[PDB]
Amino acid sequence: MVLESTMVCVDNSEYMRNGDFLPTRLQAQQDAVNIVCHSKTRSNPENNVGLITLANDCEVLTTLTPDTGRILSKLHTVQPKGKITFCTGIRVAHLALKHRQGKNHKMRIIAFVGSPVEDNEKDLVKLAKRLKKEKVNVDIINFGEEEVNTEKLTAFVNTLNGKDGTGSHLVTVPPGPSLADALISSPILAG
Amino acid sequence: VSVEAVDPVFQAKMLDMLKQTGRPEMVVGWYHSHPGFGCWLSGVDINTQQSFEALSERAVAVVVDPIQSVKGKVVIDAFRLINANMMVLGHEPRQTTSNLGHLNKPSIQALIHGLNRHYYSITINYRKNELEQKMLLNLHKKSWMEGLTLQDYSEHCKHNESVVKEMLELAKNYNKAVEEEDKMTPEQLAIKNVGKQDPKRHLEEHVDVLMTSNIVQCLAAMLDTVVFK
Amino acid sequence: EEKFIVKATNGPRYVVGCRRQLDKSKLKPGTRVALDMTTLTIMRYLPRE
Amino acid sequence: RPANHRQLTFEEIAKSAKITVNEVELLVMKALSVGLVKGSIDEVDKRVHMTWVQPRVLDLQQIKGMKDRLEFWCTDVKSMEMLVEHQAHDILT
Amino acid sequence: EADALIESLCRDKDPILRRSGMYTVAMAYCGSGNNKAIRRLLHVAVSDVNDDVRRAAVESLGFILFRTPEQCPSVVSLLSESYNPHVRYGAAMALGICCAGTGNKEAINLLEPMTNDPVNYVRQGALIASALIMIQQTEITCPKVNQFRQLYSKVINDKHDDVMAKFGAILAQGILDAGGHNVTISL
Amino acid sequence: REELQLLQEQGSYVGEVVRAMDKKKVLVKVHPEGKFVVDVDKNIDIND
Amino acid sequence: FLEAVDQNTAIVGSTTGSNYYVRILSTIDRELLKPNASVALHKHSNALVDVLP
Amino acid sequence: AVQKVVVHPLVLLSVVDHFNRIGKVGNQKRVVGVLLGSWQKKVLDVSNSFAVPFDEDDKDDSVWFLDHDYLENMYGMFKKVNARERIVGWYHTGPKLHKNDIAINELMKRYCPNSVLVIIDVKPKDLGLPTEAYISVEEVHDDGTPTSKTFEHVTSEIGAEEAEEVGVEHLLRDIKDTTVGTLSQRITNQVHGLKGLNSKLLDIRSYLEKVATGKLPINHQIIYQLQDVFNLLPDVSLQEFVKAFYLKTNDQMVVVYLASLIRSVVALHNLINNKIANRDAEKKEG
Numbered sequence A: 001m002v003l004e005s006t007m008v009c010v011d012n013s014e015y016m017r018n019g020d021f022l023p024t025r026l027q028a029q030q031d032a033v034n035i036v037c038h039s040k041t042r043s044n045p046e047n048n049v050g051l052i053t054l055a056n057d058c059e060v061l062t063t064l065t066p067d068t069g070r071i072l073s074k075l076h077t078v079q080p081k082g083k084i085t086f087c088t089g090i091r092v093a094h095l096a097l098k099h100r101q102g103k104n105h106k107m108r109i110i111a112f113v114g115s116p117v118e119d120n121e122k123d124l125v126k127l128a129k130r131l132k133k134e135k136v137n138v139d140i141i142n143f144g145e146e147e148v149n150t151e152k153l154t155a156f157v158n159t160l161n162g163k164d165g166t167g168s169h170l171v172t173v174p175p176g177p178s179l180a181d182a183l184i185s186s187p188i189l190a191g
Numbered sequence B: 001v002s003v004e005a006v007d008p009v010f011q012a013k014m015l016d017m018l019k020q021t022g023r024p025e026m027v028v029g030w031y032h033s034h035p036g037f038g039c040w041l042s043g044v045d046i047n048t049q050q051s052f053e054a055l056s057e058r059a060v061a062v063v064v065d066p067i068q069s070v071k072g073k074v075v076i077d078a079f080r081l082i083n084a085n086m087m088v089l090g091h092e093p094r095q096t097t098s099n100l101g102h103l104n105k106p107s108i109q110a111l112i113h114g115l116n117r118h119y120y121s122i123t124i125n126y127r128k129n130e131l132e133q134k135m136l137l138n139l140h141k142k143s144w145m146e147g148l149t150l151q152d153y154s155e156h157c158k159h160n161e162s163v164v165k166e167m168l169e170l171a172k173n174y175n176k177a178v179e180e181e182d183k184m185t186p187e188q189l190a191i192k193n194v195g196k197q198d199p200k201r202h203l204e205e206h207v208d209v210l211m212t213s214n215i216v217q218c219l220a221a222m223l224d225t226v227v228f229k
Numbered sequence C: 001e002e003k004f005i006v007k008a009t010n011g012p013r014y015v016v017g018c019r020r021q022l023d024k025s026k027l028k029p030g031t032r033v034a035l036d037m038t039t040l041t042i043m044r045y046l047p048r049e
Numbered sequence D: 001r002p003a004n005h006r007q008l009t010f011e012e013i014a015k016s017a018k019i020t021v022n023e024v025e026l027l028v029m030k031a032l033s034v035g036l037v038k039g040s041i042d043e044v045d046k047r048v049h050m051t052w053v054q055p056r057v058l059d060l061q062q063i064k065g066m067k068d069r070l071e072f073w074c075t076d077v078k079s080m081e082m083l084v085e086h087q088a089h090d091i092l093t
Numbered sequence E: 001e002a003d004a005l006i007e008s009l010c011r012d013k014d015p016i017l018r019r020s021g022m023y024t025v026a027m028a029y030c031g032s033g034n035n036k037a038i039r040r041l042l043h044v045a046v047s048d049v050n051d052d053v054r055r056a057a058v059e060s061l062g063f064i065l066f067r068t069p070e071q072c073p074s075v076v077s078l079l080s081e082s083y084n085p086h087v088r089y090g091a092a093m094a095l096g097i098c099c100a101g102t103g104n105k106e107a108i109n110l111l112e113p114m115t116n117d118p119v120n121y122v123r124q125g126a127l128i129a130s131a132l133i134m135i136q137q138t139e140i141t142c143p144k145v146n147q148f149r150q151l152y153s154k155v156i157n158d159k160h161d162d163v164m165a166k167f168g169a170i171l172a173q174g175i176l177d178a179g180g181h182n183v184t185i186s187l
Numbered sequence F: 001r002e003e004l005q006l007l008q009e010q011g012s013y014v015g016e017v018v019r020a021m022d023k024k025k026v027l028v029k030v031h032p033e034g035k036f037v038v039d040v041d042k043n044i045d046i047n048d
Numbered sequence G: 001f002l003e004a005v006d007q008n009t010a011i012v013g014s015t016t017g018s019n020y021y022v023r024i025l026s027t028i029d030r031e032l033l034k035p036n037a038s039v040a041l042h043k044h045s046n047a048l049v050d051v052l053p
Numbered sequence H: 001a002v003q004k005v006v007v008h009p010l011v012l013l014s015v016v017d018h019f020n021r022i023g024k025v026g027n028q029k030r031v032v033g034v035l036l037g038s039w040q041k042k043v044l045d046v047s048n049s050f051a052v053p054f055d056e057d058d059k060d061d062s063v064w065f066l067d068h069d070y071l072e073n074m075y076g077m078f079k080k081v082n083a084r085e086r087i088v089g090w091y092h093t094g095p096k097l098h099k100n101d102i103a104i105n106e107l108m109k110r111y112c113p114n115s116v117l118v119i120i121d122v123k124p125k126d127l128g129l130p131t132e133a134y135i136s137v138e139e140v141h142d143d144g145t146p147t148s149k150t151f152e153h154v155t156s157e158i159g160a161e162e163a164e165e166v167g168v169e170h171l172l173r174d175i176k177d178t179t180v181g182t183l184s185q186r187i188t189n190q191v192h193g194l195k196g197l198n199s200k201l202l203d204i205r206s207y208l209e210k211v212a213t214g215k216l217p218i219n220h221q222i223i224y225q226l227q228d229v230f231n232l233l234p235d236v237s238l239q240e241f242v243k244a245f246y247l248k249t250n251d252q253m254v255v256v257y258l259a260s261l262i263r264s265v266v267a268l269h270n271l272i273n274n275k276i277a278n279r280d281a282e283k284k285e286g
């Protein structure tokens, strides 16, 4: 089958609990993680999935493992503190990709961003240049918004994404009554 | 100890956990302990050895028994397994016979040529580099030393006028206890002079007493250095 | 005072030392004590009934 | 003064604090009552002995004196060490 | 030339290379042209605890002192009976190579305490040393009868001796019978 | 220190031979759970 | 202790009643050769360091 | 809480193993392992431990990598085979103390009880004690600075239980025991001066430099007490200690008398035998 590693980042902030959009969509995207990890389990059960947040202090809840049994139990106690962090959130994952068991597995990291980026364009294009240098697949997913959806983020993705052929895809979800599951299941990255 | 006691899935699991880490080495064998009945191998032991040697032709066997082993020597003897089809030809077709004298450390007159049938052993040597040497030597020297090293010295230096003094008095007591016999000695020296019926040396012990007496002189300069600067 | 002689129930006689934990208070003779198979140390004593 | 005749007298104290010689006993009694000074004078004839005290905030001349006394102590210990070890290494080892 | 190299490689951690320095300086200083080497040779012989450099010690000594056969047994007289048997073995090789081809009896009369020891190494070395002397020698001039008999007893004593003992024994006996007394060795 | 291993030998018993045999195998009378009959060492004659 | 049959060697009885043959160390003098005395060997080496009254 | 701790050479030799299995990486940064011991008793005792992969980032110093699963597995199996030892704290081989170490220790501060930090050197060129035990506690600051994790120095000693001494002594065959006498004592009396020399020289220079030339208020207040300790000895004239010198020199005189007398006793047999044996050997020679 397909050999790759899956890294999912969840937003522990209070912006996910807002009353306009979904009623604490954290559980919804949790169910998304569940159905996509069960999908990967059905396809290639030998894949491991790690879990960490975007907050200031990076704390791994569960190390990468093929068994999601205890992971489902570790999906709780999100510890709703902090706001957002980007750079070290990347450096705690992409640099930690070398701690995986199988060396034949491809590097794949996604993210759930529910908060505005505090970092300027410089750090963005630099980190994008780094990820492009080490050649790691990155899928940008943003749940909820305040300011304009894509402004510098477009150029960010374009500069971050190399190998136009069968490369990474950008996921942009607008406001709506529908869930995020079938919406993030639309690209080829899911299933 | 049994072949059933070893869990294959747990084994392979731990080995895999060693593979994902910085320890990429295959198992070279297995070791155990045989307390109090001797370091030899029983039926079950040689059977599970026969079962575990199916993979590795070498299968190094090591048996440690510190219980009856004196703390004077930690020297251990590794074990090997001879083939059952070699009974027709010679026993051990091994070169370099110069190390058999080093393998003669188990000089016991029972177990060796007693169990020598279909059984033998192998020589043991060590290896040390500069890093381990310097590190362990410095660590051991520090273990026999103090943190700042100036702490417990001046303590004894100032204890020379309290503790050591009593020990010096006792030393004078024992020395006098020797001297009272030394008063009887010149009579014997004026009588026999042929042969020594007294195993007591009377010399080296008093020399050692002087060695313990030199502590004051050696720590005197120490106190001088402390007082000066 | 530091090291004394012990008598086993089976009849062989031995000698032991003093542990840094226990003190010389209960170390006095006339009291049945306990020993260990390793180093022959003393965890505690054995009061008669 | 960290050195050079630490021994003092009540004259300077009475001159600075503009107090008589009768109240200096109660003064040092209060000083020992607070507990910031361990000073105890064994004197018979008129004298003042001093003891350990806390630097607290800072002093510049005591910093200069610190680096000075420290450099002197260091070069003395070094000099003695080299001097002794010079023959000690050769004749003993 | 290589003095600095040997001096630099003398402080090396490797025992094998430490012996290699002595083996290297051995043939270089042959002819007894340097009295400096024997200083650190004997120094590293006595001081160092490892028996490797100790048994590799006096070989170079015998190599450089090979000029005078008489002076060797005097200074190796202390190494006749040593603490560790390896030193006695190396000293046996020393008396073997130094007294080889000569008529010096200083080793010969000292071979009697050497031929019997609780350790087999020093015994074998004594057999070799006894093999490297009696070759090319007249029996009428000196009483070699004793050592010849004790050497001829080695083959009948093989049953009561060590397996390597009879090895070094017949190996020592192969020296005298070599070439049928026709061919010999000279340093 | 070479005798130290003979100290590790855990001592030695006291043998008593009540009878000698012509098979050159000496029987020894010992404390109960004793009586171990075996030929002596080769360097020492039996008839002595 | 039981008896000394020769020089620097003797026999020693155990608690079980079984007599043991052990050669004494050269350091030990002839004072410990007394026919009747309380002797203490090692639990392993079976050597006598000192005797007690 | 803990007055002193006991650190066995086995863990530092495991660090030697860490410098062993490297296999020429070209990175060789600080490696964080997991120390094990007994926190039950007042005095800490170290038996054995294991190793966990630890990596950081070049630029960003806030990057630290640990493993919960591997830790729970190793500690689980270790607890399975031996229940007499549990988790205590961690240690690093880094010569310098990084700011991220509080965040690294915070994990074991949460999941486990209070952890002790140990700092050693990658290259054993340090003559002083390689192991420094640092307890992690929260202390009230006098200056009023916000409460943060503070590392306090705890005294330690290097020792072994039973067999480890034998193993070390056998593997070395170089180092000597206490051995009261001339050389063993005089060696110390010689080299100790250098032991103080190199240390003090390595200290007071960086001290003098960083005091005047530096910033980041590490609370210099304790160094006034340092200088105070340096001022605790205001050049005593020894005038009061003259009697003590007299008593010490009197003891020296006692040593003189003892030495002379004892040597005079020893000279007996020598100065007898040297005559009586030689004259008899000479007269019986021919």
Ligand SMILES: [Zn+2]
Pocket: B034, B035, B037
């Ligand atoms: Zn058993």
